[PDB]
Amino acid sequence: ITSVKVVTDKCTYKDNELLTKYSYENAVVTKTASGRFDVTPTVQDYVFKLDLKKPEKLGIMLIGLGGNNGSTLVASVLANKHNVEFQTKEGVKQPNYFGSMTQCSTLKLGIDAEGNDVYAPFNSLLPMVSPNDFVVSGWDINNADLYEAMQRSQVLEYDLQQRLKAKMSLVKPLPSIYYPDFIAANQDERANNCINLDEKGNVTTRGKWTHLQRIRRDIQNFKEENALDKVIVLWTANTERYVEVSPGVNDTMENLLQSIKNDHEEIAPSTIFAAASILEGVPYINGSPQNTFVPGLVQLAEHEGTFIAGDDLKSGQTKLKSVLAQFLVDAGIKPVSIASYNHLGNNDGYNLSAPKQFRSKEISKSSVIDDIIASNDILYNDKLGKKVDHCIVIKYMKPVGDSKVAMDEYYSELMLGGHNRISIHNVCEDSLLATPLIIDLLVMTEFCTRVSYKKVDPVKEDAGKFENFYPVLTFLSYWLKAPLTRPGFHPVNGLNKQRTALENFLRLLIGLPSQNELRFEERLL
Amino acid sequence: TSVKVVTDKCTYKDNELLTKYSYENAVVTKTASGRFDVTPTVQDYVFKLDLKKPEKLGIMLIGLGGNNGSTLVASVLANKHNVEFQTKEGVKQPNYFGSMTQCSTLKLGIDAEGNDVYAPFNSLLPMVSPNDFVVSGWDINNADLYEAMQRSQVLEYDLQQRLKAKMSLVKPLPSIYYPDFIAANQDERANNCINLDEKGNVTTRGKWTHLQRIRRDIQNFKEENALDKVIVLWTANTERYVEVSPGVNDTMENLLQSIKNDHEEIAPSTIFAAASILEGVPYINGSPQNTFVPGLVQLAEHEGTFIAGDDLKSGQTKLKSVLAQFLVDAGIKPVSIASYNHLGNNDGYNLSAPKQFRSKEISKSSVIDDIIASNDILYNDKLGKKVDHCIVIKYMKPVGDSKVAMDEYYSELMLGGHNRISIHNVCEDSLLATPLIIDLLVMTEFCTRVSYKKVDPVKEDAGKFENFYPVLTFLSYWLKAPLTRPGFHPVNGLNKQRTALENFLRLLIGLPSQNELRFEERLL
Amino acid sequence: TSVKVVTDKCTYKDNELLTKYSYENAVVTKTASGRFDVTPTVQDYVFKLDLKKPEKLGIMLIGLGGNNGSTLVASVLANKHNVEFQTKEGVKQPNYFGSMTQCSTLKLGIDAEGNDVYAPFNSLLPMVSPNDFVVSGWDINNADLYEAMQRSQVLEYDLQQRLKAKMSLVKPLPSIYYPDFIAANQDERANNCINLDEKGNVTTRGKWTHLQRIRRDIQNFKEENALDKVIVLWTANTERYVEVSPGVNDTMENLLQSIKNDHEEIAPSTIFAAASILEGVPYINGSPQNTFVPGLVQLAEHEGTFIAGDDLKSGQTKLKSVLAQFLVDAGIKPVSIASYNHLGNNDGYNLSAPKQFRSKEISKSSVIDDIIASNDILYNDKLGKKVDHCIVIKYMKPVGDSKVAMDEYYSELMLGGHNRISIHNVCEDSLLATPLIIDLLVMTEFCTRVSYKKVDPVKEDAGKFENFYPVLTFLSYWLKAPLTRPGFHPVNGLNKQRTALENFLRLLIGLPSQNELRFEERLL
Ligand SMILES: NC(=O)C1=CN([C@@H]2O[C@H](COP(=O)(O)OP(=O)(O)OC[C@H]3O[C@@H](n4cnc5c(N)ncnc54)[C@H](O)[C@@H]3O)[C@@H](O)[C@H]2O)C=CC1
Ligand SMILES: NC(=O)C1=CN([C@@H]2O[C@H](COP(=O)(O)OP(=O)(O)OC[C@H]3O[C@@H](n4cnc5c(N)ncnc54)[C@H](O)[C@@H]3O)[C@@H](O)[C@H]2O)C=CC1
Ligand SMILES: NC(=O)C1=CN([C@@H]2O[C@H](COP(=O)(O)OP(=O)(O)OC[C@H]3O[C@@H](n4cnc5c(N)ncnc54)[C@H](O)[C@@H]3O)[C@@H](O)[C@H]2O)C=CC1
Ligand SMILES: O=P(O)(O)OC[C@@H](O)[C@@H](O)[C@H](O)CCO
Ligand SMILES: O=P(O)(O)OC[C@@H](O)[C@@H](O)[C@H](O)CCO
Ligand SMILES: O=P(O)(O)OC[C@@H](O)[C@@H](O)[C@H](O)CCO
Ligand SMILES: [N+]
Ligand SMILES: [N+]
Ligand SMILES: [N+]
């Protein structure tokens, strides 16, 4: 067990609650016609409260429990909790959570006697729930048990599957909501575990309110069966087709809840799962690209006061594309073309192989290149032109199974007519990056649920009343391709900037300032 | 474009900016029971930034005649004289693409909707434009720069023609050639040497007179062009390391005497560095060799003059450290990273000799180990703490100034998985190196107008500002083997190297470091 | 599956096939006025093919314990015993994928619509199945083959388990270890040597007794398993070249005496070759070193025994020569071709020492120059006749038996254009090398049952068939440095190397070479 103790007066302990003062420094800007920027610093003090008692067991309910991520998720928790070593060509391997930023990355705390950086585990600063403590269940329009699911996914080593077989065969996904109209036509016949069944013949979109009612009880049953207090619900089922946002159906909390009761065609399964977890106060994370969080549902989350998040699981390929485009744009290099090509052979790509679920994926990237462009008008402006041509191609190639082969090509302008051509080729089992991502998301959103804050007025020595995070956790933007936002802010996609934001946050909770990297004890004396 | 920040941390005196800044950091100890005790620390400073910038800045290049030297002078001239040019794709306007100082922006804060507001990196505190450089320099080869652009085949043909009248007037001054310090094959290119023995032959006797002829070239260049601010920058071929020894180059006095005694361990590099210092002219070592022996680091101190260096951040190497860091930060464990490449220039040709190649070798490394070092969750004695890696560069003349760079990363993923990522990179690398060279002269100059004082919280004064430590570590973003100060670790991590500059520029104008929390949005 | 061709060129005698064949070719002279005078030539032959094939064939591997050796025995056993196996993807049935002899087809002609009719390559004249090999061999390391599959990490885990009972019974016999012939680092692996000095230590004294203990191992293996046909094949680590010198290894008699005199130029390789010959057992040199010094080529002749070799056609190298040839045939001029690679096996580890690496070096080459050679429209003194090329292989242990191979071609196109083509190749190369090894033993055996006579058109007889020249050049499709006969050029050109076999098989059954005109379709 690793831990950190920061000697500071900004932090006080009380009844297993960390109380921490922090002064938030920003700056507002107006730019003068002559091109003069007027900058005025700003400052807001805050008091932050971290409930330190983390739940001993955290409940996790996956919509798509039966898929590759779903199954590989349960497999990794089981394998790591019970130390199930497994055979491989390269030998006997110990289980681990590689690819997880919360379990496996470190953070610089400061320096040592000799100006030498000292790092600590990201999860050793403040108390976090361990994925070995998840208790997982979930839903799936398909009745396969999780052993059958590991089999079918073909993600993990055959020996591992064989050692997990006795426990996974016992996990059975709960029946789900299957509305045909919302996913690729080829998912029909997998759908053999629905609760939305009529008098006999079955599947029907009639009864959406009772469906909502059914998902809420599933959550309450799951909680008591496991004697658990906290649960997070996470969508990792097949990408749905975006719904049309219209004035009177799902524009407002009142409209939504009724269109549901009315069985409006614009109420999708994810719509129901979302409203059912909000209505129970359990945080809902949207891991797919469809737009489940329509304004009417964002409102009900604000009204119930419950954590929501997502819009697509942020790759490892798409991540890297940003790290890469930003590096190029901060070095004053101009990407004029970024071609993104992709193939994988899982259900995931079988479902994306329809243009209506592929549009959702395509629309998720439809903002990134637009954000790196905006930040540099010396490079992109009306004179030198301000487009970066781009394309996304996702083809279904069955023989490569869960492997995703990803290729992106960057053609950029250099000074005096030169160009630079960079190409990144990436191959890996997709689920094996998606799963540790999923785990970081749960683990973070649970950490956030225990954090509250209060505005503090310097002249009125003590004001405010502790409140919770704005419902929309943009803190998790780091792991989601299309970060959802509050109705005034543009999305921020800069990978390295999203992580910095998390570490500065953890840092501030234990009384340390933003990392500045200036190293004046080396650079001066 | 300019920037004005309301803060009381900044006062504009004569034509001086006085800025107060509070430096927070922390010291950590580890128990051996797994606890990290963290003690924050503070140090208050005052920074004085002379705001009067030379309106003309002199740049003197060792290796003025090459691919980097030539294309440097071509881009100053083309941009300065707005020389548009013809290509397959239409008329093109010149620019400084690739330069962090001229072409990247910085976040200053947010406007009134909560959106990010960026500004030119160079619009926060005045900096010299490369349009005002005035360039001269030396080269063991006398070709003129028109001929040097021809021979380098880096630039478009029609732009070489549009600059021909001006580039043909520039000639490299003669230089110091100690054949046994470079690749034997650079022999016959050497037709412009000052070190000639009373016969006519290049000698190695007379190292002090060569040191004096170089100070004379720097005075004369300053006189003939009426400039007080000059910067020297080595962009010549990689020498081979000299051996650091007691009583020859360990101290200012040994080194001086050594040069006087014609000692085998004094390299052309060495002479130019020393001549620059003696003249108070900042010296930037753009190549891998160990020019800054200790003995030379003293002299710089003593004279109060800058020095910065060891190898221009080959930017293939940039993209590499970044990639790597992204993987280590995401909880991914690289276990091998193979780096390969080829290029067909003199650059590749002079490296083809192993001894010069050995300099690129270790100027590099010390990045893999720093990334390994920072994450013992991944790298330890139980899961193994190594990352196999190799560096291979071969001379393939047909490709020219083109560099084909290939890097393959094989990493462990969770539960037996693996990830194979490969980066293929094609560009003329002179077109990356030139803007780097600009970025650096533009930053070496700025630093030169900045001084500081360590203050106190109830007992300060006696006054007296001091100059940056000689070693300009703020220029590590651009060099591959970041010179340092003893026992201190050479951390690379391009991104972080860039946060440093940015945050420094920011502080000078009383703006705290960026933090990315976006509370006006995250907090209700 | 079988093939029956109606021709009068073929008569089936005892259990012998007598085939008549007419060999057309041409001799050319060039004027120096630019005219090529072409004289066709003909030579008639009779080929006798003993159709009785050993029902069991013995294979003895030097290096039985490695990646190639181990996985060879595993695929004979798995295919022979139909051992299906478990994987992420489901149960898999074993096969010999990658073997030209077991898994490629040949065009025999057309059916009655004009469409091509193909047949198994091995269904035209009987050949031995690798399912009937019986394998033994030697290895400086005593591990058993179950342990050798473990340590090689080439095969699936569950198939290693299903073969465990059988592979653990196989043990490599001890071998000859002259430490100074391999990479110093292969020292400690050496725990199974016959060359021990009356103390216990590996010696280099007694080279004739080691030569005799190897003939004894081959007799005993033949006796204990009741087989008359055995083939030996070197798949051990690359030795370093020995120097060919007058009066030591230039002739059969010097070489024999040299071995007796314990001469430094006799390598383990050498001893095994010679022991094989002395036993009439064909010997295949699957590595780069120069085992077949002249002196040894004589002995093979004299005894009427095969020899074939120099380096297993690394098949990355295959894909290369092919690519290259396609470009030269399309009127495209490669001007540079960079070849890079890494792998993490003992193979890569033993090459890591430069001297063993120097053997892969020149076993290669002689392909670029043959392609250059054939097209002086492209390569001449006026447009330049060279193609810059390099070969780099580094040991990256983390990748295992995986070989990552990268090749980049930069070529001149018309009117200033260029083309940059790059081939990235990832596979465990043992899984390519093993089928190659099979293909070759299966073809060395076939050749062994084939004899020929040069006939005449009005004066033939006196009779007497003769054996193939010792050097089996028909096996160049699979080796990188195709041994030859003096002054004759080592032409590679995989495709053409394959046309040769195919056309030979074809002729033996009285089928003319393929021509691809498809007159029944092209002509009315
Ligand atoms: N598979 C992977 O490796 C990665 C997937 N992701 C994402 O996560 C989502 C699914 O990923 P996979 O696990 O790969 O796909 P999958 O298709 O393997 O698994 C989805 C599961 O969802 C179930 N499902 C679909 N409609 C449902 C409903 N109404 N209720 C309950 N279950 C339903 C299906 O039956 C299936 O078992 C995708 O939409 C994508 O955003 C992103 C990166 C990697
Ligand atoms: N060429 C490029 O595009 C890049 C250059 N760099 C680096 O910068 C260095 C310079 O490279 P390039 O411009 O490419 O090489 P080059 O070989 O094109 O230029 C070197 C100039 O140095 C001159 N030279 C060498 N010895 C000299 C001495 N004693 N005095 C005076 N001049 C002398 C040579 O004559 C030559 O003209 C390399 O060593 C390497 O550090 C690294 C990345 C890209
Ligand atoms: N490993 C592969 O998958 C491929 C192999 N090849 C070639 O075939 C050769 C064999 O390679 P691998 O099976 O891979 O290597 P390995 O290093 O896996 O096998 C070599 C076997 O030779 C044994 N050995 C070496 N000196 C010996 C001697 N004097 N007597 C007896 N056995 C001795 C070693 O102990 C070892 O067990 C290489 O040298 C190279 O020519 C080339 C392409 C692919
Ligand atoms: O089809 P799935 O399982 O939903 O995963 C989709 C992908 O192709 C993934 O790489 C990414 O989210 C899309 C862009 O590469
Ligand atoms: O050819 P030059 O001018 O000597 O530049 C050398 C390089 O290509 C540089 O990348 C170094 O040799 C390798 C580190 O990336
Ligand atoms: O590693 P081994 O078994 O010694 O095989 C060597 C090779 O990878 C082979 O490709 C050779 O070294 C290069 C020619 O392509
Ligand atoms: N996927
Ligand atoms: N270069
Ligand atoms: N190999």
Side-chain angles (χ1 to χ4, degrees), chain C residues 87-100:
Chain C
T87 68
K88 293 191 307 89
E89 300 72 16
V91 170
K92 287 306 163 166
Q93 294 326 306
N95 54 49
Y96 285 106
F97 289 17
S99 173
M100 180 211 324

mmCIF file of all heavy atoms in Angstrom, chain C residues 87-100:
data_model
loop_
_atom_site.group_PDB
_atom_site.id
_atom_site.type_symbol
_atom_site.label_atom_id
_atom_site.label_comp_id
_atom_site.label_asym_id
_atom_site.label_seq_id
_atom_site.Cartn_x
_atom_site.Cartn_y
_atom_site.Cartn_z
ATOM 1 N N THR C 87 -7.652 -22.759 -29.987
ATOM 2 C CA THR C 87 -7.115 -21.384 -30.016
ATOM 3 C C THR C 87 -8.243 -20.405 -29.742
ATOM 4 O O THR C 87 -9.408 -20.809 -29.745
ATOM 5 C CB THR C 87 -6.493 -20.942 -31.495
ATOM 6 O OG1 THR C 87 -7.559 -20.860 -32.393
ATOM 7 C CG2 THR C 87 -5.454 -21.845 -31.994
ATOM 8 N N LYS C 88 -7.887 -19.097 -29.624
ATOM 9 C CA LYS C 88 -8.875 -18.009 -29.467
ATOM 10 C C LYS C 88 -9.856 -18.153 -30.534
ATOM 11 O O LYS C 88 -11.037 -17.773 -30.391
ATOM 12 C CB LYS C 88 -8.321 -16.602 -29.738
ATOM 13 C CG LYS C 88 -7.315 -16.221 -28.703
ATOM 14 C CD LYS C 88 -6.789 -14.732 -28.607
ATOM 15 C CE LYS C 88 -6.227 -14.139 -29.922
ATOM 16 N NZ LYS C 88 -7.490 -13.607 -30.446
ATOM 17 N N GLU C 89 -9.402 -18.614 -31.688
ATOM 18 C CA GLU C 89 -10.398 -18.659 -32.758
ATOM 19 C C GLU C 89 -11.113 -19.924 -32.941
ATOM 20 O O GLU C 89 -11.906 -19.987 -33.883
ATOM 21 C CB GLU C 89 -9.824 -18.238 -34.060
ATOM 22 C CG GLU C 89 -9.295 -16.851 -34.017
ATOM 23 C CD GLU C 89 -8.032 -16.683 -33.223
ATOM 24 O OE1 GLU C 89 -7.289 -17.673 -32.887
ATOM 25 O OE2 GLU C 89 -7.708 -15.506 -32.900
ATOM 26 N N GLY C 90 -10.933 -20.943 -32.073
ATOM 27 C CA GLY C 90 -11.700 -22.162 -32.340
ATOM 28 C C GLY C 90 -10.800 -23.346 -32.620
ATOM 29 O O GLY C 90 -9.585 -23.195 -32.640
ATOM 30 N N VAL C 91 -11.363 -24.523 -32.783
ATOM 31 C CA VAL C 91 -10.397 -25.620 -33.018
ATOM 32 C C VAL C 91 -9.753 -25.487 -34.393
ATOM 33 O O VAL C 91 -10.405 -25.186 -35.332
ATOM 34 C CB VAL C 91 -11.019 -27.102 -32.850
ATOM 35 C CG1 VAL C 91 -10.031 -28.222 -33.352
ATOM 36 C CG2 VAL C 91 -11.128 -27.302 -31.403
ATOM 37 N N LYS C 92 -8.469 -25.727 -34.451
ATOM 38 C CA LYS C 92 -7.775 -25.591 -35.716
ATOM 39 C C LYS C 92 -7.204 -26.972 -36.128
ATOM 40 O O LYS C 92 -6.651 -27.658 -35.293
ATOM 41 C CB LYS C 92 -6.569 -24.612 -35.526
ATOM 42 C CG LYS C 92 -6.881 -23.119 -35.361
ATOM 43 C CD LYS C 92 -7.717 -22.795 -36.572
ATOM 44 C CE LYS C 92 -8.542 -21.495 -36.543
ATOM 45 N NZ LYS C 92 -9.038 -21.150 -37.991
ATOM 46 N N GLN C 93 -7.325 -27.322 -37.423
ATOM 47 C CA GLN C 93 -6.728 -28.548 -38.009
ATOM 48 C C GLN C 93 -5.357 -28.197 -38.517
ATOM 49 O O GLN C 93 -5.186 -27.223 -39.183
ATOM 50 C CB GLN C 93 -7.514 -29.063 -39.212
ATOM 51 C CG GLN C 93 -8.935 -29.586 -38.962
ATOM 52 C CD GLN C 93 -9.031 -30.259 -37.604
ATOM 53 O OE1 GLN C 93 -8.256 -31.151 -37.320
ATOM 54 N NE2 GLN C 93 -9.901 -29.756 -36.734
ATOM 55 N N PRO C 94 -4.334 -28.982 -38.226
ATOM 56 C CA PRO C 94 -2.955 -28.754 -38.690
ATOM 57 C C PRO C 94 -2.833 -28.816 -40.206
ATOM 58 O O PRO C 94 -3.729 -29.379 -40.869
ATOM 59 C CB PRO C 94 -2.178 -29.840 -37.989
ATOM 60 C CG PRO C 94 -3.326 -30.900 -37.637
ATOM 61 C CD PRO C 94 -4.392 -30.020 -37.205
ATOM 62 N N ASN C 95 -1.740 -28.276 -40.774
ATOM 63 C CA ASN C 95 -1.620 -28.265 -42.233
ATOM 64 C C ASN C 95 -0.256 -27.963 -42.416
ATOM 65 O O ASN C 95 0.476 -27.873 -41.424
ATOM 66 C CB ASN C 95 -2.478 -27.191 -42.866
ATOM 67 C CG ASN C 95 -2.167 -25.744 -42.228
ATOM 68 O OD1 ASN C 95 -1.019 -25.318 -42.094
ATOM 69 N ND2 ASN C 95 -3.172 -25.116 -41.838
ATOM 70 N N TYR C 96 0.159 -27.843 -43.717
ATOM 71 C CA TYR C 96 1.538 -27.550 -44.061
ATOM 72 C C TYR C 96 1.599 -26.158 -44.882
ATOM 73 O O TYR C 96 2.521 -25.932 -45.642
ATOM 74 C CB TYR C 96 2.181 -28.699 -44.884
ATOM 75 C CG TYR C 96 2.534 -29.945 -44.029
ATOM 76 C CD1 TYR C 96 1.788 -31.083 -44.104
ATOM 77 C CD2 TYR C 96 3.645 -29.962 -43.283
ATOM 78 C CE1 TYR C 96 2.161 -32.346 -43.398
ATOM 79 C CE2 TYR C 96 4.045 -31.092 -42.640
ATOM 80 C CZ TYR C 96 3.265 -32.327 -42.720
ATOM 81 O OH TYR C 96 3.854 -33.460 -42.138
ATOM 82 N N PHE C 97 0.544 -25.329 -44.759
ATOM 83 C CA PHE C 97 0.580 -23.880 -45.277
ATOM 84 C C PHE C 97 1.995 -23.317 -45.288
ATOM 85 O O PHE C 97 2.780 -23.560 -44.372
ATOM 86 C CB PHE C 97 -0.255 -22.997 -44.443
ATOM 87 C CG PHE C 97 -1.627 -23.253 -44.628
ATOM 88 C CD1 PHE C 97 -2.002 -24.428 -45.200
ATOM 89 C CD2 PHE C 97 -2.567 -22.372 -44.319
ATOM 90 C CE1 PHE C 97 -3.333 -24.650 -45.428
ATOM 91 C CE2 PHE C 97 -3.886 -22.561 -44.565
ATOM 92 C CZ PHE C 97 -4.261 -23.776 -45.144
ATOM 93 N N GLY C 98 2.360 -22.698 -46.424
ATOM 94 C CA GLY C 98 3.697 -22.194 -46.549
ATOM 95 C C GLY C 98 4.589 -23.164 -47.243
ATOM 96 O O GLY C 98 5.765 -22.912 -47.386
ATOM 97 N N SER C 99 4.109 -24.378 -47.523
ATOM 98 C CA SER C 99 5.105 -25.347 -48.145
ATOM 99 C C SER C 99 4.732 -25.273 -49.669
ATOM 100 O O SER C 99 3.532 -25.397 -49.975
ATOM 101 C CB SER C 99 4.812 -26.878 -47.732
ATOM 102 O OG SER C 99 5.752 -27.680 -48.547
ATOM 103 N N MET C 100 5.710 -24.992 -50.521
ATOM 104 C CA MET C 100 5.423 -25.019 -51.975
ATOM 105 C C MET C 100 5.124 -26.570 -52.334
ATOM 106 O O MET C 100 4.130 -26.863 -53.003
ATOM 107 C CB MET C 100 6.680 -24.574 -52.778
ATOM 108 C CG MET C 100 6.389 -24.593 -54.348
ATOM 109 S SD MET C 100 7.796 -24.946 -55.222
ATOM 110 C CE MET C 100 8.985 -24.242 -54.441
#
